C-alpha cells in the first residue's frame, strides 16, 4: 500500500508546504541506480546514464534510486528530479562513472546533488569532482555510510567524508542514532533513516533503512530552502541547515543533530 516517510513530519517539511514552498523549479540530481519514472507517484524531469552497460536512466533494476526519488519528492513534492544513473542493478558503480554524473549535473545547472552511496577508498579525482560541484554553487549531500562505530576513529565513507559534502547520518523516530550509522568528525547532520517508507519500482512501496535514506531527506530539505530562497547560495543553504539543527547527542555521533527545515528556511 501507499506510504510516506515519517521523516517528512520529523524534519518539519509540512510547515514549509503550508507556507507555499514545495520545491518548485529546484533541480535535484539523484546520483543512484536510476529512477523508475513509470511509478504513478514519481516525476522525473530528465536524467542521463554513466553506467556503460545500462544506458537507460529511467529503468531502475536495483530499486534504490527509486526509493531515494520518492523520499526526496515526499519532502519536496514539486522539485524537478533528474535520474543520473551511476550505479548498476547490483548497487555498485565505479568512481569514474560517479564523476561523470557529477560533471553532468554541473553542466545541466542542478541545484542539488544527492549521493546516497559511498565507498571506503579515497580518490583525488572524486574529491576534485565534488569540490568543483560545490564551487559551482551546487548543494552536495551524501550518506555518511552504514559502518557503525570503531572506537575513536572515523567510519564515514567517501564522498561524504570530504569537507565540501554534507555528510548525513541516520536517526529513528525517537531521534536516536541508528546503531549502524557511520560516525566521525566529518559527520555534519542527521535525518530520519530507519525503515523509511518510500517508492519502489512497479508502482510498489517499501520500508528501507540506511544513511542512504537520511541523505534523501536533507536533499529534499535543501530544495525546499531554495524554493523559498532561490537567491541563496549553496554556502548559505548549508549554513542554515547546520546552524538550525536540533541538538541531539555528541557531535562525533550526531553532528549538529537533526535537520529542522522550518528553522533553516528563516
Amino acid at each position: 500500500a501507499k506510504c510516506v516517510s515519517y521523516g517528512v513530519a520529523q524534519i518539519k517539511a509540512p510547515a514549509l508546504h503550508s507556507q507555499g514552498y514545495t520545491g518548485s523549479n529546484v533541480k535535484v540530481a539523484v546520483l543512484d541506480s536510476g529512477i523508475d519514472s513509470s511509478h504513478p507517484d514519481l516525476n522525473v524531469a530528465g536524467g542521463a546514464s554513466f553506467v556503460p552497460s545500462e544506458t537507460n536512466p529511467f529503468q531502475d533494476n536495483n530499486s534504490h534510486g527509486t526509493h531515494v526519488a520518492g523520499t526526496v519528492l515526499a519532502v519536496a513534492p514539486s522539485a524537478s528530479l533528474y535520474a543520473v544513473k551511476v550505479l548498476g542493478a547490483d548497487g555498485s558503480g565505479q568512481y569514474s562513472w560517479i564523476i561523470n554524473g557529477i560533471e553532468w549535473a554541473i553542466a545541466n545547472n542542478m541545484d542539488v546533488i544527492n549521493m546516497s552511496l559511498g565507498g571506503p577508498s579515497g580518490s583525488a579525482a572524486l574529491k576534485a569532482a565534488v569540490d568543483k560541484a560545490v564551487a559551482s554553487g551546487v548543494v552536495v549531500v551524501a550518506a555518511a555510510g552504514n559502518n557503525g562505530t570503531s572506537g575513536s576513529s572515523s567510519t564515514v565513507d567517501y564522498p561524504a567524508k570530504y569537507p565540501s559534502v554534507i555528510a548525513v547520518g541516520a536517526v529513528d523516530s525517537s531521534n536516536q542514532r541508528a546503531p549502524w550509522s557511520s560516525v566521525g568528525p566529518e559527520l555534519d547532520v542527521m535525518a530520519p533513516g530507519v525503515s523509511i517508507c518510500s517508492t519502489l519500482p512497479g508502482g510498489k512501496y517499501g520500508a528501507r533503512s540506511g544513511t542512504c535514506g537520511a541523505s534523501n531527506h536533507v536533499a529534499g530539505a535543501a530544495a525546499l530552502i531554495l524554493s523559498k530562497h532561490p537567491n541563496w547560495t549553496n554556502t548559505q543553504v548549508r549554513s542554515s541547515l547546520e546552524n538550525t539543527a536540533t541538538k541531539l547527542g555528541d557531535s562525533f555521533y550526531y553532528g549538529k543533530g537533526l535537520i529542522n527545515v522550518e528553522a533553516a528556511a528563516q
Binding site: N62, Q94, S123
Partner: peptide, 9 residues
C-alpha cells in the same frame, strides 16, 4: 584503472 574504485548503495 587501479585508481578507479567502486562505491555502493
Amino acid at each position: 584503472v587501479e585508481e578507479d574504485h567502486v562505491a555502493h548503495a
